[PDB]
């Protein structure tokens with residue numbers, strides 16, 4: 001009802017221009033299709049949790065702090081590339097060195113923790 | 120009451136330190152066990168309670184200040200704990216005795232100003248704390 | 263032997279060291295035969311029997327089963343009083359209304375540590391050292407073992423340490439070396455042949 | 464099968480990199496170009512072999528000279544390393560001093576037997592009965608081994624490694640409670656033998672991980 | 686869990702450390718106008 | 734189960750409040766004593 | 782040597798990235814809202 | 830005598846001596862060979878004698894009252910006295926088996942003699958010594974916080 005009222009009242013040609021208005025549209029559309037599916041589906045359930053995120057931009061200062069730091073992170077993309085290269089090099093070396101250690105259950109090289117795959 | 124400023128405020132601070140030492144000596148035995156040291160320390164705590172009440176009633180002229188507020192809140196809760204212990208989680212009501220070492224900062228202004236500065240340097244972190252609260256809530260619901 | 267077992271069931275023995283105490287008592291009853299009389303008592307600010315016996319019993323197969331069940335159903339709560347606990351133990355070794363062995367009279371204390379020596383109790387009850395006192399320090403702790411060691415050799419006893427499960431079996435059988443001291447001094451009068459009860463080989 | 468396909472891919476990749484160094488060499492007659500030849504050389508020589516396989520990981524480093532931003536950030540990192548070398552030397556010397564003190568304090572005292580009943584090597588031999596999970600009715604036979612701790616203070620290198628692990632704030636309580644129980648040169652531990660020895664660990668943590676590590680970040684910031 | 690660690694801890698630790706750094710500088714550039722650095726400088730300038 | 738989980742706030746408060754003090758004590762000592770030393774070098778180098 | 786070197790390198794690079802991000806926008810971290818700022822101009826623009 | 834102590838060869842000779850002291854200190858290990866213990870315990874003696882000879886030369890070459898003020902050399906006399914006390918203490922009728930490992934630390938602190946001429950380490954040390962009062966105040970407040978929470982934990986989970 002909120003969506004239909006706002007799209008009627010806010011000239012839908014420019015309604016989708018804002019980021020917030022488009023964001024909540026995807027939330028309800030994913031949520032509105034699950035009403036008949038109650039009797040895959042789990043992915044659309046997480047959409048309705050995201051409505052709380054819009055409440056983060058309702059305060060003066062917590063929104064601008066985030067804006068400034070994500071803008072700063074976007075302004076320096078090559079610094080994280082050093083971390084990425086370090087991770088790549090050390091992962092490849094770990095593959096080549098300790099990639100043949102057997103996986104057991106009582107040790108720190110187990111099925112969840114080993115050098116047998118890049119991820 | 121009568122003018123007693125330089126000896127009184129350092130004697131009471133020494134009393135605070137002695138109470139801290141006495142609280143440190145006590146051994147929390149399991150399942151209501153005890154020894155002789157705790158048997159003596161209960162009477163020591165009694166004497167500390169009477170001396171604290173005496174020095175509180177001496178200077179009442181006092182409640183509006185927060186530090187003095189805590190100062191007599193500790194005394195009154197200790198008195199109530201003693202009354203309830205004698206008239207028998209009553210033993211847990213003595214956990215307020217742990218705040219007595221905190222009274223020592225009120226006796227040293229040079230450290231009181233440092234504590235005030237550290238506390239006042241916390242307001243800018245409230246936005247980050249609020250952001251952490253939203254992140255925790257959102258991830259808890261997602262999980 | 264007219265054995266009597268004192269078990270410390272005060273508050274400080276709650277936890278792991280109570281499990282070791284119960285196992286140590288059970289393994290110690292396994293070293294008693296039909297000619298030995300045993301009874302188990304506890305003390306925590308008050309000394310009382312752990313079972314329905316209230317005096318020394320023959321310690322046959324049926325009676326040991328009752329004592330083991332009673333020992334395996336004790337809880338730790340209260341304060342420690344060695345003066346009250348030892349007076350109860352010495353009083354059950356002076357009964358003489360009931361059938362006993364009229365032989366080795368030993369008190370075994372299963373405690374962890376403490377500060378009371380109970381010098382007045384020992385002087386009041388056994389001035390002539392007619393009763394041996396074996397003291398055990400059971401569990402992993404840092405309590406004072408001084409008084410426990412003193413009670414042992416002041417009354418012709420011995421001191422044992424049980425810090426783990428693996429030390430239970432070897433320490434509950436070493437008290438027969440102390441009891442065998444008067445036998446070796448007898449000489450040829452102690453070289454008599456005895457026959458056991460019927461048992462499966 | 465996957466490696467055979469991927470090995471075929473490397474053959475074409477190592478040829479394009481080979482045809483561009485020669486093409487560049489035609490028009491010329493720095494240290495980054497030598498690195499590019501080094502990577503191509505290893506692949507051709509590979510065609511022991513384990514060392515060359517390890518050195519094959521130098522492929523991403525060839526992109527530093529291409530992107531300007533990567534070169535700039537690498538140069539900035541090197542400059543930051545140079546300007547902060549004073550603090551690293553001081554904290555390394557402090558760790559060395561604490562390692563020497565720890566060697567003097569816990570030299571060989573971290574030994575223990577497989578069963579907590581034998582407290583010297585002359586007794587920690589043969590087999591013993593193990594009671595699983597504390598149950599007296601579930602015994603099992605196990606060997607007796609007189610083994611040293613994984614992280615100990617035997618010599619200077621071991622002490623430095625143990626102190627590094629402590630300064631990373633990981634697994635330090637276990638080392639603390641292992642050092643508290645340390646009795647003597649070649650005998651087993653006792654529960655809470657010397658609690659006052661924890662002053663060494665507390666002082667080391669406060670001096671290095673809280674002071675000399677926060678001063679690192681503060682110096683970077685300033 | 687990987688996203689929770691990066692956003693919840695790495696990002697927030699950057700939040701706190703940055704705010705703290707920007708708060709220390711405020712009081713550093715205010716007490717500097719008093720002359721606290723001069724007192725240290727004057728004491729050290731006469732040691733040589 | 735039960736109301737025993739309410740004691741978890743002791744370790745939640747101790748971690749959050751304890752770690753805040755550490756970042757406001759050891760970091761403050763470093764920051765306010767490194768800018769002082771850094772500024773001394775600028776004064777000492779120029780005066781040299 | 783593999784694990785020790787990785788830990789040291791990763792810690793240093795993370796510190797470097799954090800400090801670079803903090804210093805990229807340092808005016809906001811020392812804004813001193815009392816005097817003035819872009820927020821005042823933005824409010825002016827919105828009201829206008 | 831002032832010509833030698835202010836020369837360039839004397840400083841490097843002292844550097845070599847302190848490097849040898851550090852090498853002797855950082856060579857002990859579990860199950861060390863029996864021939865190395867004697868080397869260590871004679872090197873300690875001879876190097877202590879040489880260091881105390883150097884110290885007495887330094888004391889009676891410039892001025893007694895001009896060195897006590899400076900904190901850089903103030904603890905050097907204490908270190909030398911402790912070293913010279915350790916030898917007689919060990920060799921006399923006082924064994925002190927743990928006393929060997931407590932007297933090696935004061936001899937170990939001699940490594941700091943290499944960090945005198947830095948102009949960057951000492952620059953921060955000056956500010957640290959100036960603000961030591963605030964440093965101690967902050968540390969004492971942290972200690973009080975830890976004590977309060979330890980007492981509360983003792984009360985709750987004791």
Ligand SMILES: CC(C)OC(=O)[C@H](C)N[P@](=O)(OC[C@H]1O[C@@H](n2ccc(=O)[nH]c2=O)[C@](C)(F)[C@@H]1O)Oc1ccccc1
Nearest residue numbers: 676677680698701702749752753755756760791792795796
């Ligand atoms: C390696 C992990 C930890 O990822 C990092 O953050 C980097 C790779 N290194 P780091 O050594 O991490 C530990 C420090 O985190 C501080 N912390 C956390 C939460 C809080 O609320 N308050 C607070 O102070 C601390 C508890 F103090 C610790 O000392 O980072 C440092 C950054 C600044 C100063 C010193 C260390």
Ligand SMILES: CCCCc1oc2ccccc2c1C(=O)c1cc(I)c(OCCN(CC)CC)c(I)c1
Nearest residue numbers: 551554555630631632672676679789790792793796
């Ligand atoms: C790229 C080469 C520099 C890496 C490096 O070398 C050092 C030598 C001595 C002391 C520190 C370093 C260092 C670091 O960058 C470094 C090392 C550590 I360990 C370190 O602290 C470990 C993380 N943290 C655990 C919570 C310590 C408190 C930090 I922050 C930075």
Ligand SMILES: *[C@@H]1O[C@H](CO)[C@@H](O[C@@H]2O[C@H](CO)[C@@H](O)[C@H](O)[C@H]2NC(C)=O)[C@H](O)[C@H]1NC(C)=O
Nearest residue numbers: 316317318352353354355356357358359360361
């Ligand atoms: C048996 O033990 C009792 C106490 O356990 C001793 O005390 C006597 O108990 C009987 C039973 O009533 C009575 O004779 C008296 O009440 C008690 N005193 C005396 C002097 O007899 C008793 O002495 C012990 N022996 C006998 C044969 O009873």
Ligand SMILES: [Ca+2]
Nearest residue numbers: 152272274342
């Ligand atoms: Ca007890």
